[PDB]
Amino acid sequence: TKGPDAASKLPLVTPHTQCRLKLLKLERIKDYLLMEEEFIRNQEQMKEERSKVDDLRGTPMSVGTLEEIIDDNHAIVSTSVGSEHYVSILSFVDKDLLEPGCSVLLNHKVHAVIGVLMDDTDPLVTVMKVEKAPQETYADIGGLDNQIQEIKESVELPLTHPEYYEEMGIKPPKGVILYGPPGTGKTLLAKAVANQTSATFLRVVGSELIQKYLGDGPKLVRELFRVAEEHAPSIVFIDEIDAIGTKRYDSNSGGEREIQRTMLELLNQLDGFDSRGDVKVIMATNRIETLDPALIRPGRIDRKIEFPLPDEKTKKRIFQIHTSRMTLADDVTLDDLIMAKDDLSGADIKAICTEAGLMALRERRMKVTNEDFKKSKENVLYKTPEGLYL
Amino acid sequence: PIRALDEGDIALLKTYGQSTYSRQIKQVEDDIQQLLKKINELTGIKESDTGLAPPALWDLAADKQTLQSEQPLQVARCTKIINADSEDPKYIINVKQFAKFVVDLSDQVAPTDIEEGMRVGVDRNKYQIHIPLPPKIDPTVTMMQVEEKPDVTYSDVGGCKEQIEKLREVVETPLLHPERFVNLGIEPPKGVLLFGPPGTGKTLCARAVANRTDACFIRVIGSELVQKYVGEGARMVRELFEMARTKKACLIFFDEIDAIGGARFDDGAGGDNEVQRTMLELINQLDGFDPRGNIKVLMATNRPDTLDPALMRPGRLDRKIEFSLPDLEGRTHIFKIHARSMSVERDIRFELLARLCPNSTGAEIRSVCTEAGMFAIRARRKIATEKDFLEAVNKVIKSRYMTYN
Amino acid sequence: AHHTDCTFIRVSGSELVQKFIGEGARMVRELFVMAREHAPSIIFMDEIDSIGSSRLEGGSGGDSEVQRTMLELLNQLDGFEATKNIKVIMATNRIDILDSAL
Amino acid sequence: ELSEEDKQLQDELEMLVERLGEKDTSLYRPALEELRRQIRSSTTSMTSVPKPLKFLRPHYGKLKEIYENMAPGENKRFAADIISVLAMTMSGERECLKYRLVGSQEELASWGHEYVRHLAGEVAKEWQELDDAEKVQREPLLTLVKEIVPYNMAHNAEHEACDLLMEIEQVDMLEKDIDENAYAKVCLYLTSCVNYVPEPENSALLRCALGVFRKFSRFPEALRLALMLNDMELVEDIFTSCKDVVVQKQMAFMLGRHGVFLELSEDVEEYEDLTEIMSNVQLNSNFLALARELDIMEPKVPDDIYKTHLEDSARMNLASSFVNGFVNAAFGQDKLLTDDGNKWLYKNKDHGMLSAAASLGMILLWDVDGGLTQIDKYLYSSEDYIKSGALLACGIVNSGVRNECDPALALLSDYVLHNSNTMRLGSIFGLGLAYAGSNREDVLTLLLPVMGDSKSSMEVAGVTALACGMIAVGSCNGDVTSTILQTIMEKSETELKDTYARWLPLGLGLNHLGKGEAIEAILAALEVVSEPFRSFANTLVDVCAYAGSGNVLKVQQLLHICSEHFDGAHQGVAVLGIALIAMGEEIGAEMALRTFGHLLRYGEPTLRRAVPLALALISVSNPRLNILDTLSKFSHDADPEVSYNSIFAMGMVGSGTNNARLAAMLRQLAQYHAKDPNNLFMVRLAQGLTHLGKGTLTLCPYHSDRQLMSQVAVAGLLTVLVSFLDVRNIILGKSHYVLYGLVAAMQPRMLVTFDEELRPLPVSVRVGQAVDVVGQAGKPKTITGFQTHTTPVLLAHGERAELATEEFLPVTPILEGFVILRKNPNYD
Amino acid sequence: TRSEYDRGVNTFSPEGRLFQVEYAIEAIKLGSTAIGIQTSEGVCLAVEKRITSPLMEPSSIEKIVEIDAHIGCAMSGLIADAKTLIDKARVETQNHWFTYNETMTVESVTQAVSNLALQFGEEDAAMSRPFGVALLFGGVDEKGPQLFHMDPSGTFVQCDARAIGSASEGAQSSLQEVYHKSMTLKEAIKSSLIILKQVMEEKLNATNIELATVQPGQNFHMFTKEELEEVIKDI
Ligand SMILES: Nc1ncnc2c1ncn2[C@@H]1O[C@H](COP(=O)(O)OP(=O)(O)OP(=O)(O)O)[C@@H](O)[C@H]1O
Ligand SMILES: Nc1ncnc2c1ncn2[C@@H]1O[C@H](COP(=O)(O)OP(=O)(O)OP(=O)(O)O)[C@@H](O)[C@H]1O
Ligand SMILES: [Mg+2]
Ligand SMILES: [Mg+2]
């Protein structure tokens, strides 16, 4: 129960326009930051037994794996080179806190237990934590109201109002899979969750839990969920999970068997024998049909959220959101682009806006226009026989 | 017909359409970012808990505990006493990962309590023995065992009556009532493979077994048995079965054993023969040239068709049990179990809901109940009603049959 | 590459396809870490249809590992923590087969 | 690298400029005409790269020379204008208006709008760099401002005009150019800017927005702004300068929710109805109607909150009394005291009794007659503590309700100056929290005399200070200040080291809450106290002066005080002060949270104890995981006082919220501290706060749109928190009754509607987060995350309500509290 | 494993099962429930009509149809196969009347329909898969009222009371609990409607059900709206 790690983020200046009010808000943020900096400086400018204890502690302390603690002052430790020694335990160590497998600390020369180092989290899993917070609030997601509602009910309401569920003896969904075509808000709705959540967010990509050696992928998955459970509440976002989790066929190769083994370790973590803490999982997928049923099972993935290509009103929302910060001209009616019944993702709409801005800049004009938007729409979109029906 | 922006174009587009506050805003934002960096730099780095005890529990002069009793004895296994040559023992030691040696005792007040393979302690410079040690316990396998009983009983497993009865027989009756089996002269099966579609009560039944049994229960982490260092997985399974034999009555629970070994066909799997080797050692332990003792095995798997026939053979997996999709009565019972704790109306037709959910698993039904509660919540209502349950069924089971009227 | 003053990185062909498991993805991650370090960076990727093309159903007849490499590349191009100053120039000879995700 | 036409234009401009260079002095006028025509044709166009501007860049200096060297005349200024429009692009010595002033003075729109924007910014910049002299140089700039403000008005650039005027420091001319199609988008922008600017500009902007609102007869908004300015003459003018009676009823509701009460003569159309609304005589009935309309009138005993059945000597029973009072607050009904009775007001082991009786008052809150009945049953006791608690209960009952009769005055005045410091110590506090916003002279004339007399302990003197400050919050009442200062000047270093002396400076600050600068006198007439009780008094009065001001300079001074190493209590006051100056603007609050975290880590114990109180004050009845997690990880601290404060701050931050993931923390914390009674009491008190009024009251001192700071609420919060500044003695002991100061703050969290007859109108509303989509410097905020209910309804923190249907028009554009709704004539 | 044994109707599985017949019997469940009750005073049929939306007039969902003047058929399964088998039953009854100048018995007509249904792949009948429809022929003949149930495999058998369709498993239990031989036709109608209301997700009222009866006397009568409302009043 170390506690939530959160992600420090500065306030948001409501007026996106360049005006004095924005200047005042930013100046207030800056002046508070300056006061904090000077306070730290003044603390350190106005500022024995433990020092000698640390001197007695080895200078280049080594890290070794405790194994089969014995007696009350003698334990067997490992040197991380396979060798193991019947070392002694100084009084400095906590005791009643050493457990087998714990990465204790050893004096370099005499090899005596002198520390416990209960923070031996692998770098591969420490990197995949979220310390910043992307500035994609839910107000940057045009439409997707139902999807936002589902994910809020899954990963936000259980933390902000944990009385509704206890009031009817219901466990909220622990798993969500966001599936859809290539670019519809699947990753925005994880960015927004990270931005607006007080829980430890853990980015991951399915193609990252796979490791070169044997038994390392499952070990990494176990470590990832162990840290996600130590820090609680926590959310684990596995983007593009079809990297690992595809159908479990009868393998003939060895790498494929190892990948499936990693997938089974993930399945056991999601819903295994023992239990699961307050760790909530959000997977993302382009092609859900190819995923294994055991993974899509509605005990590991309680909610499945489709992100279809936006309809007309959602498309209008996307254009509004992505042209808000643009000096749109009064000649532009963002309806001609909406009406055309062509596959337009939110990514396609943003690319359309960017290309319209670039067309204006090419024409030497800083204010976009309708012809610019038409040209951008034509030149951004890259990609049944006639008369066969009707 | 598209000019390229010149020096003047860029020098005017940055200076002509411009707010009189744009420069100040940009500078202030940059200052905020730099100040954030500097603040993080100054107060950065916490104090990683090193394990120090609260003061007044320490004992200085432990520098004397470091200078005396200094010997950081390595651990060695006496593999051959060289016959003891009567006198002049000249023991042999097998310091693992380091070397073999021919050594003697030193201040060993009991030169007789040395034995072979007793895991003696040996100095660094002169390798004389100093103190024996108890046998190795392999902490991974030590924690593989289940200590705290999960809070699942044989009453939250609805829709599985025959399977529960078979599992109860094989896993409990030989343990708590051997009299009937010995009377009838039947040796009960030692080994069960629970298989079925993903989510039917396999691991739930394993949890219920763990709760009910009064005997060693060992949940085997399928990932802990795969490692580098070829032979390590086989060694771990060997030690696991050794500890199981040590225990008076043991119940191993290989879960998702599709991880540890399917078909043995290698072809291009030359790099995946280590998993096959540990699976072969598991097979040998399950049934080979040796009695296995009072060890009963559970093996859960969704896909019992990738498994090795040598492992599925009914000398190792003797009581294969199938967790099929529950029938209507089972589905109604699962609804009742899962909605017992829910705040629902007093006239919901769970038989109707079981009818509405065909070819649906117990996990599916749990999801239906959860979504019914969620729909009630999404309307500020405290009591989930039949309408909410029907909406949940529609949302979970499915997500036009006008030819099937 | 000749006319730019930005750090020019170049993958081409199947330089990210490794026989070992989960190595192409790691190489892509290290690539983009290096580009971020030496930003602003331009990453050329010649013949991307080698590393990155229409995905096949995971089975006995599918290059699941190259698919994983491509998925890692997709995540690096646009996932969490968008790139800061890295620009990518992919080159292909037949575009109809590239994954719609790319 | 150009084009043929582009090169030809370059050549034309070169030829014209060269001709200007040649000393013909005969064909200058045609050349200047042609240059001007080209420049304005390019500038007025949509091109963002005006070509004549681009091509005259090299010749800027040559144009300067030609302007200097040509003889005075029409051509002089006719070319100075060209030089100015050119200088719009190249600057550094800020020439554009420097040559516009010596110019042709034509319409300041022919040169596009970019010229206007540049010249407006430059007018501002010239204004700052002008000393108080050079006035003659300042009129010609106001002519440019009168040409710029209308132009910005006509072109949707209202925020540009507002910036220009507030940066020229004359927000007075908007009234000439505002139109009925602009007042909203100008007043909202001014109000947004108010929070972030300092004085005297804060008041200048507030009065400008008030004038704009009064222009178009938007009286309720004008009254909100007039309340932001703690100025009663302006609110009297607004409330009496109106002819529509319903809007006056609504403004009376607003005045009642705020602490103010206007003494109206026998002239208004409905004086008695208005004074009833403004006196909150209908608050109890409306609250009980809301409680009935939600099925909450079912008193819940402390055990229902403790919830110890699932998952009693002397102090946990005091905790039971306090939690019972908090939970069943303003409901009248109870099950422990009300009903059986005489059981949880006895066995409370002496001193705690004084608060247990007060619990009754908090159950019969806003209910004067029922108060009277039940309290009078207990107002006649053989032991002093019961009578003191009953008097305090009368005070609580009359808190927030301005009865025409004065029950509190009579009953509690009989017992002020009583021959016992315990009836005094309940009657004084009852009067203080009964007539808080009143500012009545007849109650101060009875209270001030009791701070000085041989028969008064530091407890009685401090509670009189608290009472007088609460009566006269933010009024600079001379009698209060004089008496408090005399009491501080008439006591030695010892006898001034009791921690009940904190309350004399607290009375001063409360009497000067929000006044700000005007406080120098009291910190200049107070530089004669002993050293240890002068940093405390100085700092406390200073922080009280700037309550909600958001003055970063004062926060900097407080942080300097914190930095100092004193092996010292004024540091604890300074932490609470950093919280107090920054409970307004939202941007200040989060940054203050970062600062408070740093203080918790890089901080001595003295301010370490105070950071939790600051966290409670900055977020009151606003449970957020950022603060609750901070307090929870500090609820296990080794230092008992930091713990105690952290637990109570968890209670406050979640006060009146029924938060489940705070109730769980408090129960787990109750098991963890089961064997420590001094933490068990505080966790029980936090539970009571979390379930305050069973989820129907808020302690936040900010009501209307989160923008009006109720003086009385801040008074109560400061009393309680400053008392916590010494928990171990003030409250974990003798003066645990001071908790009832929170009565001044608890105020319903409901939306209730009426017709134009003071009769309920259940109507449909959408309740949701105070979010927007695009501010665009003036665009209102629109609710996101709708959830449709039918009024009456409870609004949580950050929730606003918008009429789901157009059928009714609210009088005020703020749907919080009591709102009168006119039936729309248009349709629906 | 049922991938080389259920792809054709003429391939036995190692257990000796026709999985395609199993699958047709499963397709039966996708229809709406229908309860038939045989009594000494006649036979009653009551079916859950499953109106998907308005604008589809009720006389297009033919779950209860008339075979001759003395038999009714309550159907569950594919509409097309239902139509085929109903037409066969009607034509067979008329053929028997034409030849022998009498009314075909309910057992005999069910036998003829079953004889049509047997011919899955028998290469001399042309249907290639089992009729995915299950029928309840309730009629009156010289042996008193009778009710017969026929399933896709062609197996038919009399039934003192039966329920087919989606709510078959859950309604036959109720029929077992409530049915006794000495029951009147009004009691049978009331009990059948009670069970239908139990097993329907929609509320029982007026439309969404059909009710019919064949008695020793008046011909097969399908209750109209008036009679349906009268019974539903106090089911
Ligand atoms: N509903 C939306 N609202 C706003 N922006 C959107 C929306 N959908 C997509 N976008 C835009 O799409 C771009 C990124 O999309 P996103 O990362 O959500 O896609 P995705 O579903 O994760 O795609 P992929 O399968 O390729 O990883 C951003 O420009 C984002 O603004
Ligand atoms: N027969 C059942 N009775 C009650 N609950 C059941 C039943 N079957 C499944 N469940 C519910 O489903 C979950 C149990 O799933 P379980 O772990 O048994 O799956 P599994 O069959 O082992 O699946 P997999 O191995 O594919 O992950 C719990 O929510 C349990 O409530
Ligand atoms: Mg994505
Ligand atoms: Mg399982």
mmCIF file of C-alpha atoms in Angstrom, chain A residues 10 18-20 22-23 26-27 29-30 33-34 36-37 40-41 50 52-53 56-57 67-68 70 73-74 76 81-86 88-94 100 105 109-111 114-118 149-150 153 164-165 167-171 173 213-216 218 222 248-250 252-254 257-258 261 264-265 267-268 272-274 293-294 297-300 302-303 361-364 366, chain B residues 2-5 9 13 19 21-22 24-25 28-29 31-32 35-36 38-39 42-43 49-53 58-59 63 65-66 69-70 72-75 96-97 119 124 133-137 139 143 146 198-199 203 206-207 210 217 219 221 223-224 226-228 253 255-256 258-259 262-263 265-267 269 272 274-276 302-303 306 341-343 363-364 366-367 370-371 373-374 377-378 380-381:
data_model
loop_
_atom_site.group_PDB
_atom_site.id
_atom_site.type_symbol
_atom_site.label_atom_id
_atom_site.label_comp_id
_atom_site.label_asym_id
_atom_site.label_seq_id
_atom_site.Cartn_x
_atom_site.Cartn_y
_atom_site.Cartn_z
ATOM 1 C CA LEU A 10 -0.038 22.242 -13.868
ATOM 2 C CA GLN A 18 -3.902 35.266 -26.783
ATOM 3 C CA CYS A 19 -5.229 37.946 -24.434
ATOM 4 C CA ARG A 20 -4.372 39.595 -21.139
ATOM 5 C CA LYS A 22 -4.321 34.269 -20.283
ATOM 6 C CA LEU A 23 -1.229 36.322 -19.471
ATOM 7 C CA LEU A 26 0.173 32.125 -16.745
ATOM 8 C CA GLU A 27 1.905 34.814 -14.686
ATOM 9 C CA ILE A 29 1.369 29.990 -12.293
ATOM 10 C CA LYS A 30 4.875 31.357 -12.850
ATOM 11 C CA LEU A 33 6.560 28.429 -9.177
ATOM 12 C CA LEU A 34 9.085 31.173 -8.402
ATOM 13 C CA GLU A 36 8.335 27.547 -4.531
ATOM 14 C CA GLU A 37 11.830 27.691 -6.023
ATOM 15 C CA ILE A 40 13.419 25.433 -1.517
ATOM 16 C CA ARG A 41 16.522 27.581 -1.922
ATOM 17 C CA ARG A 50 23.455 7.587 11.542
ATOM 18 C CA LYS A 52 28.806 6.511 11.610
ATOM 19 C CA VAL A 53 26.306 3.684 11.083
ATOM 20 C CA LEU A 56 30.201 1.003 9.189
ATOM 21 C CA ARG A 57 27.859 -0.087 6.396
ATOM 22 C CA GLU A 67 17.399 -17.278 0.605
ATOM 23 C CA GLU A 68 16.332 -19.331 3.631
ATOM 24 C CA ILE A 70 18.136 -18.845 9.499
ATOM 25 C CA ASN A 73 21.200 -13.344 13.121
ATOM 26 C CA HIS A 74 22.428 -15.628 10.292
ATOM 27 C CA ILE A 76 21.976 -17.540 3.493
ATOM 28 C CA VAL A 81 26.697 -14.736 -9.642
ATOM 29 C CA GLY A 82 25.137 -18.041 -8.593
ATOM 30 C CA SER A 83 27.317 -18.369 -5.498
ATOM 31 C CA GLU A 84 25.663 -18.206 -2.089
ATOM 32 C CA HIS A 85 27.069 -17.499 1.359
ATOM 33 C CA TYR A 86 26.074 -18.170 4.970
ATOM 34 C CA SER A 88 25.383 -12.734 9.189
ATOM 35 C CA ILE A 89 22.774 -10.034 9.813
ATOM 36 C CA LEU A 90 23.769 -6.841 11.576
ATOM 37 C CA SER A 91 21.396 -5.154 14.005
ATOM 38 C CA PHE A 92 20.901 -2.301 11.519
ATOM 39 C CA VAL A 93 18.639 -4.467 9.363
ATOM 40 C CA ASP A 94 14.929 -4.291 10.118
ATOM 41 C CA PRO A 100 13.025 -15.287 0.782
ATOM 42 C CA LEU A 105 21.886 -5.643 0.586
ATOM 43 C CA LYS A 109 33.781 -7.516 1.594
ATOM 44 C CA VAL A 110 32.512 -9.300 4.711
ATOM 45 C CA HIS A 111 29.176 -10.055 2.990
ATOM 46 C CA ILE A 114 22.848 -4.758 6.083
ATOM 47 C CA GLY A 115 19.875 -3.665 3.975
ATOM 48 C CA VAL A 116 16.779 -4.982 2.260
ATOM 49 C CA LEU A 117 16.283 -2.720 -0.782
ATOM 50 C CA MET A 118 12.541 -3.278 -1.110
ATOM 51 C CA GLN A 149 -19.399 7.115 -20.187
ATOM 52 C CA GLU A 150 -18.422 3.442 -20.248
ATOM 53 C CA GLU A 153 -18.046 3.991 -15.153
ATOM 54 C CA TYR A 164 -22.930 3.292 -5.683
ATOM 55 C CA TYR A 165 -21.431 -0.168 -6.155
ATOM 56 C CA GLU A 167 -24.829 0.046 -2.121
ATOM 57 C CA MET A 168 -25.920 -2.866 -4.334
ATOM 58 C CA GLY A 169 -23.157 -5.405 -3.802
ATOM 59 C CA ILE A 170 -21.768 -5.071 -7.328
ATOM 60 C CA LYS A 171 -18.123 -5.219 -8.358
ATOM 61 C CA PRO A 173 -15.790 -3.856 -14.314
ATOM 62 C CA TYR A 213 15.113 -15.087 -23.469
ATOM 63 C CA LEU A 214 13.010 -17.969 -22.166
ATOM 64 C CA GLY A 215 10.651 -17.280 -19.288
ATOM 65 C CA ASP A 216 11.389 -13.548 -19.308
ATOM 66 C CA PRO A 218 5.995 -14.048 -18.295
ATOM 67 C CA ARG A 222 4.186 -10.800 -13.433
ATOM 68 C CA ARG A 248 -3.880 -19.550 -29.354
ATOM 69 C CA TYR A 249 -3.273 -22.117 -32.086
ATOM 70 C CA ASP A 250 -1.214 -25.315 -31.855
ATOM 71 C CA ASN A 252 5.155 -25.724 -34.108
ATOM 72 C CA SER A 253 7.883 -23.139 -33.408
ATOM 73 C CA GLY A 254 9.482 -22.245 -30.099
ATOM 74 C CA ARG A 257 5.070 -21.142 -27.823
ATOM 75 C CA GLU A 258 6.946 -18.623 -25.680
ATOM 76 C CA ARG A 261 3.178 -18.565 -22.639
ATOM 77 C CA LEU A 264 -1.182 -17.188 -20.523
ATOM 78 C CA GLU A 265 0.789 -15.391 -17.827
ATOM 79 C CA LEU A 267 -4.415 -14.234 -18.521
ATOM 80 C CA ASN A 268 -3.521 -15.586 -15.087
ATOM 81 C CA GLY A 272 -6.129 -16.299 -12.091
ATOM 82 C CA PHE A 273 -6.348 -18.606 -9.099
ATOM 83 C CA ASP A 274 -5.579 -16.315 -6.193
ATOM 84 C CA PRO A 293 -11.547 -15.871 -26.409
ATOM 85 C CA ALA A 294 -9.814 -16.557 -23.087
ATOM 86 C CA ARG A 297 -13.469 -13.436 -21.738
ATOM 87 C CA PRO A 298 -15.990 -11.358 -19.750
ATOM 88 C CA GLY A 299 -14.193 -12.025 -16.499
ATOM 89 C CA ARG A 300 -10.931 -10.472 -17.632
ATOM 90 C CA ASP A 302 -15.868 -6.953 -18.592
ATOM 91 C CA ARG A 303 -16.494 -4.176 -21.134
ATOM 92 C CA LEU A 361 0.469 29.147 -45.438
ATOM 93 C CA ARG A 362 1.534 28.078 -48.935
ATOM 94 C CA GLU A 363 -0.801 30.702 -50.398
ATOM 95 C CA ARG A 364 0.869 33.137 -47.938
ATOM 96 C CA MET A 366 -2.519 32.889 -42.179
ATOM 97 C CA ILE B 2 3.598 27.795 -55.798
ATOM 98 C CA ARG B 3 6.090 30.338 -54.500
ATOM 99 C CA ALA B 4 8.322 29.405 -51.578
ATOM 100 C CA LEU B 5 8.273 31.526 -48.437
ATOM 101 C CA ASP B 9 7.372 36.110 -45.761
ATOM 102 C CA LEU B 13 3.905 36.121 -40.795
ATOM 103 C CA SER B 19 -1.468 39.425 -30.659
ATOM 104 C CA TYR B 21 0.525 39.517 -25.864
ATOM 105 C CA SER B 22 1.830 36.569 -27.903
ATOM 106 C CA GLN B 24 4.823 37.566 -23.396
ATOM 107 C CA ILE B 25 2.673 34.427 -23.330
ATOM 108 C CA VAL B 28 6.004 33.017 -19.628
ATOM 109 C CA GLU B 29 5.231 29.462 -20.744
ATOM 110 C CA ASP B 31 9.732 30.244 -17.945
ATOM 111 C CA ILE B 32 7.141 27.969 -16.333
ATOM 112 C CA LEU B 35 11.032 26.561 -13.393
ATOM 113 C CA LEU B 36 9.323 23.172 -13.295
ATOM 114 C CA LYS B 38 14.554 23.415 -11.738
ATOM 115 C CA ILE B 39 12.091 22.562 -8.960
ATOM 116 C CA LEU B 42 16.275 20.575 -6.411
ATOM 117 C CA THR B 43 13.760 18.418 -4.469
ATOM 118 C CA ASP B 49 13.734 2.815 2.004
ATOM 119 C CA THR B 50 16.865 0.764 2.662
ATOM 120 C CA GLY B 51 15.475 -1.400 5.477
ATOM 121 C CA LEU B 52 17.076 0.365 8.443
ATOM 122 C CA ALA B 53 15.372 -0.392 11.745
ATOM 123 C CA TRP B 58 20.552 -1.290 16.695
ATOM 124 C CA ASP B 59 23.604 -2.451 18.628
ATOM 125 C CA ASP B 63 31.815 -3.951 14.175
ATOM 126 C CA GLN B 65 30.322 -8.971 15.138
ATOM 127 C CA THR B 66 31.847 -8.161 11.739
ATOM 128 C CA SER B 69 32.232 -14.544 13.452
ATOM 129 C CA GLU B 70 33.670 -12.843 10.381
ATOM 130 C CA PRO B 72 31.346 -15.477 5.533
ATOM 131 C CA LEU B 73 31.025 -19.227 5.159
ATOM 132 C CA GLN B 74 30.141 -20.427 1.707
ATOM 133 C CA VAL B 75 27.726 -23.360 1.552
ATOM 134 C CA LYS B 96 28.214 -24.892 -6.557
ATOM 135 C CA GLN B 97 29.149 -22.575 -9.443
ATOM 136 C CA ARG B 119 25.095 -28.743 3.012
ATOM 137 C CA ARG B 124 36.850 -18.786 1.840
ATOM 138 C CA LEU B 133 23.137 -26.390 7.499
ATOM 139 C CA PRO B 134 19.627 -27.761 6.939
ATOM 140 C CA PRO B 135 18.664 -28.864 3.418
ATOM 141 C CA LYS B 136 17.807 -26.288 0.778
ATOM 142 C CA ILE B 137 14.143 -25.305 0.480
ATOM 143 C CA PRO B 139 12.015 -20.375 -1.849
ATOM 144 C CA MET B 143 5.924 -19.836 -1.794
ATOM 145 C CA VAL B 146 -1.147 -21.847 -0.861
ATOM 146 C CA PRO B 198 -12.971 -20.127 -21.401
ATOM 147 C CA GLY B 199 -14.806 -19.384 -18.178
ATOM 148 C CA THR B 203 -10.422 -22.052 -11.563
ATOM 149 C CA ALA B 206 -9.925 -25.074 -7.951
ATOM 150 C CA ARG B 207 -10.488 -22.232 -5.476
ATOM 151 C CA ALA B 210 -8.347 -25.026 -1.965
ATOM 152 C CA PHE B 217 -2.338 -27.407 -1.788
ATOM 153 C CA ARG B 219 -0.782 -23.677 -6.906
ATOM 154 C CA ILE B 221 2.702 -20.750 -11.375
ATOM 155 C CA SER B 223 5.514 -19.050 -15.600
ATOM 156 C CA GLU B 224 7.737 -19.929 -12.641
ATOM 157 C CA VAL B 226 9.962 -21.730 -17.409
ATOM 158 C CA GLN B 227 13.395 -20.146 -17.061
ATOM 159 C CA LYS B 228 16.772 -19.720 -18.702
ATOM 160 C CA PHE B 253 -2.894 -27.495 -9.124
ATOM 161 C CA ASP B 255 -3.193 -24.014 -13.865
ATOM 162 C CA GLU B 256 -3.107 -23.233 -17.576
ATOM 163 C CA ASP B 258 -1.058 -25.441 -21.894
ATOM 164 C CA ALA B 259 1.852 -23.126 -21.082
ATOM 165 C CA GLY B 262 2.020 -29.270 -25.636
ATOM 166 C CA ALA B 263 2.934 -31.679 -28.411
ATOM 167 C CA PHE B 265 7.155 -32.208 -32.092
ATOM 168 C CA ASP B 266 10.266 -30.031 -32.281
ATOM 169 C CA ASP B 267 11.208 -29.516 -35.949
ATOM 170 C CA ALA B 269 11.486 -25.672 -32.010
ATOM 171 C CA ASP B 272 11.984 -24.666 -27.165
ATOM 172 C CA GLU B 274 13.724 -26.823 -22.550
ATOM 173 C CA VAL B 275 9.988 -26.464 -21.910
ATOM 174 C CA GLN B 276 9.437 -29.905 -23.428
ATOM 175 C CA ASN B 302 -9.145 -24.240 -21.949
ATOM 176 C CA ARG B 303 -7.515 -26.094 -24.858
ATOM 177 C CA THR B 306 -2.534 -28.972 -27.773
ATOM 178 C CA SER B 341 -25.802 -9.918 -2.871
ATOM 179 C CA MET B 342 -27.311 -7.446 -5.348
ATOM 180 C CA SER B 343 -30.016 -4.974 -4.348
ATOM 181 C CA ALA B 363 -18.572 -15.512 -16.318
ATOM 182 C CA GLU B 364 -20.968 -14.223 -18.976
ATOM 183 C CA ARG B 366 -21.682 -12.583 -13.829
ATOM 184 C CA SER B 367 -21.085 -9.863 -16.405
ATOM 185 C CA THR B 370 -22.816 -6.520 -13.085
ATOM 186 C CA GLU B 371 -24.144 -4.637 -16.113
ATOM 187 C CA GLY B 373 -26.416 -3.111 -11.562
ATOM 188 C CA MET B 374 -24.471 -0.617 -13.666
ATOM 189 C CA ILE B 377 -26.621 3.087 -11.175
ATOM 190 C CA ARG B 378 -26.717 5.068 -14.442
ATOM 191 C CA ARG B 380 -29.765 7.109 -9.857
ATOM 192 C CA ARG B 381 -31.807 4.023 -8.867
#
